[PDB]
Design a protein around this ligand. Structure first.
Ligand SMILES: *OCCCN1/C(=C/C=C/C=C/C2=[N+](CCCO)c3ccccc3C2(C)C)C(C)(C)c2ccccc21
Ligand SMILES: [Cl-]
Length: 759
DNA sequence: AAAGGCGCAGTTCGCG
DNA sequence: CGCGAACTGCGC
């Protein structure tokens, strides 16, 4: 099984290293014959000689073109003749490419920023993570001594805990009386002993939770203090820091540093992403949190250090359990995209698509379009019309069916051959013309993307049948990830088309997909209303909620199925409208905001405050109580009584702090903000103390009593203590609970005033 | 357990 | 006072 690739340089020459695990053994293969290259489009072919005469400097050495060869390629399906320029070292390319592009004979240049190790994987058609090779893993976590306002890395590391399938242990330099604690003499001997543990176990994967940003950087700081070479690599190297957009990520050579944080952050939508929250969210079991104050407290005085030890052990253990569960999904996705799990696990869907397309472009001899420069990126600034959203008919309705398309957008892309190479092609025999926006798509040949996207859907269908046929639970689980990875990739082509930084960016294509999607859904609604007697209550993009106002549960069900059998022949083959489910009651508040209840009492909520992290738990739970009363039974007057005792509790300061926390994400550097709402106001104070604030950070704040501008009376949720603070009962009644329950109860004639306690 | 796409409902706060 | 830009997070 291929894990990863890199290169090193021997005597000036690049040597690819392929890191593999074969038959229980880690292997390194070397490739010294691989030549870096990019392509040049010339005016005259006779100009190639002056292009080879071009030179540049790399650390004082003169870099030149090693050799060039004229090649025949396709560019967006059209024939193109370019010169492949070979170099001795991949580092020659950045050094020399600008001066070559500048040359008066060079129309343009291509494929000059594909990193050498990634290029190797693509050109050699190698796929990482193939096979059944079992990989050993090791999780680890550290615990640091922290005090208010301190610089990063100055305080020592108190604990390093680790875990694999067999055990979870803790290394520390004070005496703690627990079976799983290992006591050594100093911080240095603790870090040294951890190194020894890792080298001993020799894990293929190192799992951390936010290790990319904290654990490796802090171990780095400490190791430089204590004079310790931090050797974690299988080749005996220190962990390598790589840049990833604004963020940092950490490699460990010969191993896979699987940082769970960016994976979970992409995968699951949660209010907070603390290790405790994630574990609770994934495994259902709760995990107790010990704060850096309590930790610091205990260390100064050997007090409650068994609780801190337990905490540290649990960090590593829990980190290992989540690692084991998220890894396989990430490996299938890596196998699909054809890039290392290290890269893939830290990539957006858009980046995954691009790596997929770069590899497919190589297979089919399609020259890749470049990433857009600053200028072109400005011409990609305009937006376009998206999904259709129907203004709902507000209120409570009985006996609702939800009908929808599955994979609307990729079906459209395949059906109509939507593709930047099929867009606006002259002299074709057959065209598909997008509604409203009017773009023509040639149908005489499968386009680059639709071809790839059609292969995906077939392969997925093959895997689903294997999955359903198999009696082997392990194979079933594996195929399930495989088919889930294909879906994600299939679903990302659309977004990619309209993503301004894409090589295969195409606004006209993304517009056409959305215009078709509107045509189809609006047609389905029109037929359902006119042909059958249904009242369409609401619709969004690819699906709709409907019912027949007089009808009982059985009539609506029958009539819905019968409408599908009527409507589906009238849609293109790939576009199948499906019956998703039946709901005894539903309540639609506004666009994007509704909630339904099914026959088994289960309630589904969409868009309402209940599902948002920037609404306090008291406003959300209460809004839930109100919805439950109105959905489960028909009792409005119950919901009002619910709101009565909640606002009454709040006004008398009896609701715990836990239910008052509001969560809001920082989305940019704090300097770039131009309007300072409470979450920025809190974040700015934190940063003033010495707390690292990065885009993506979630601020948890509570609103204390005392009035005026909200951001002033807001404090971080952790620093709230009832012995010192009184919360703003007025804010949580008037700005949280009452507005949240008003959305619903205003539909029944209740205003904010008759729901309060006082006045 | 889709979303670097777009369509929306909504809160904060300074503004005249 | 009402208004509107700034800003967040949702549904697809
Ligand atoms: O989409 C949110 C994350 C889903 N997800 C995964 C979830 C694994 C869950 C395991 C749960 C579990 N429970 C709780 C069941 C609650 O409905 C439980 C209770 C009693 C005994 C055993 C268990 C186990 C531990 C089975 C995984 C599969 C990790 C995954 C991978 C990739 C993306 C999302 C998810
Ligand atoms: Cl280009």
């Amino acid at each position: 099984m291929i894990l990863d690739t890199d290169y090193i340089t021997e005597n000036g020459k690049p040597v690819i290293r392929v890191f593999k695990k074969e038959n229980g053994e880690f292997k390194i293969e070397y490739d010294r014959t691989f030549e870096p290259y990019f392509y040049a489009l010339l005016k005259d072919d006779s100009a190639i000689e002056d292009v080879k005469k071009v030179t540049a400097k790399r650390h004082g050495t003169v870099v030149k073109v090693k050799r060039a060869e004229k090649v025949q390629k396709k560019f967006l399906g059209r024939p193109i003749e370019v010169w492949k320029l070979y170099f001795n070292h991949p580092q020659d390319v950045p050094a020399i490419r600008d001066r070559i592009r500048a040359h008066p004979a060079v129309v343009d240049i291509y494929e000059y920023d594909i990193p050498f190790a990634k290029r190797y994987l693509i050109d050699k058609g190698l796929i990482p993570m193939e096979g059944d090779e079992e990989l050993t893993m090791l999780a680890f976590a550290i615990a640091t001594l922290y005090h208010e306002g301190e610089e990063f890395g100055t305080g020592p590391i108190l604990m390093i805990s680790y875990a694999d399938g067999s055990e979870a242990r803790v290394i520390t330099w004070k005496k703690i009386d627990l079976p799983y604690v290992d006591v050594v003499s100093t911080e240095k001997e603790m870090i040294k002993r951890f190194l020894r543990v890792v080298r001993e176990k020799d894990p293929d994967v190192l799992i951390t939770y936010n290790g990319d940003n904290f654990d490796f950087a802090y171990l780095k700081k400490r190791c430089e203090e204590l004079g310790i070479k931090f050797t974690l690599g299988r080749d005996g190297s220190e962990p390598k820091i790589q840049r990833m957009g604004d963020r940092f990520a950490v490699e460990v050579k010969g191993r896979i540093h699987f940082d769970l944080y960016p994976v979970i952050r992409r995968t699951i939508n949660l209010p907070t992403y603390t290790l405790e929250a994630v574990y609770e969210a994934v495994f259902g079991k709760p995990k107790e949190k010990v704060y850096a104050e309590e930790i610091a407290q205990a260390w100064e005085s050997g007090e409650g250090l068994e609780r801190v030890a337990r905490y540290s052990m649990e960090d590593a253990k829990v980190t290992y359990e989540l690692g084991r569960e998220f890894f396989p999904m990430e490996a299938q996705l890596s196998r699909l995209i054809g890039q290392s799990l290290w890269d893939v696990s830290r990539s957006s869907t858009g980046n995954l698509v691009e790596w997929f397309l770069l590899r497919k472009a190589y297979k089919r001899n399609e020259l890749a379009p470049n990433k857009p420069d600053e200028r072109e990126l400005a011409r990609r600034r305009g937006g376009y019309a998206g999904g259709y959203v129907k203004e709902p008919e507000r209120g409570l309705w009985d006996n609702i069916v939800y009908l929808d398309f599955r994979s609307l957008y990729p079906s459209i892309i395949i059906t109509h051959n939507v593709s930047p190479d099929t867009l606006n092609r002259e002299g074709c025999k057959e065209y598909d013309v997008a509604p409203e926006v009017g773009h023509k798509f040639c149908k005489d040949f499968p386009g680059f993307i639709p071809s790839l996207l059609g292969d995906l859907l077939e392969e997925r269908q093959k895997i689903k049948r294997k999955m359903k046929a198999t009696v082997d639970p392990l194979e079933k689980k594996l195929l399930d990830y495989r088919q889930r990875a294909i879906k994600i990739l299939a679903n990302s082509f659309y977004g990619y088309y309209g993503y301004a930084k894409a090589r295969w960016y195409c606004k006209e294509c993304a517009e056409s997909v959305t215009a078709w999607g509107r045509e189809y859904i609006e047609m389905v609604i029109r037929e359902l209303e006119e042909k059958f007697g249904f009242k369409v209550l609401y619709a969004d993009t690819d699906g709709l909620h409907a019912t027949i106002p007089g009808a009982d549960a059985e009539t609506v069900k029958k009539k819905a199925k019968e409408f599908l059998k009527y409507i589906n022949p009238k849609l293109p083959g790939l576009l199948e409208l499906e019956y998703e489910g039946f709901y005894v009651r539903g309540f639609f508040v506004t666009k994007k905001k509704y909630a339904v209840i099914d026959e088994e009492g289960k309630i589904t909520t969409r868009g309402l405050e209940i599902v948002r992290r920037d609404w306090s738990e008291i406003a959300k739970e209460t809004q839930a109580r109100v919805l439950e009363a109105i959905l489960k039974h028909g009792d409005v007057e119950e919901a009002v009584r619910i709101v009565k005792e909640v606002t009454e509790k709040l006004s008398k300061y009896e609701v715990p702090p836990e239910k008052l926390v509001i969560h809001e994400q920082i989305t940019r550097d704090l300097r770039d903000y131009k309007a300072t709402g409470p979450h920025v106001a809190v974040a700015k104070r934190l940063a003033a103390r010495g707390v690292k604030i990065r885009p993506g950070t979630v601020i948890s704040y509570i609103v204390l009593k005392g009035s005026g501008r909200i951001g002033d009376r807001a404090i971080p949720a952790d620093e709230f203590d009832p012995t010192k603070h009184r919360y703003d009962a007025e804010y949580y009644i008037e700005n949280q609970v009452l507005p949240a329950v008003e959305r619903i109860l205003k539909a029944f004639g209740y205003r904010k005033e008759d729901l309060r306690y006082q006045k």
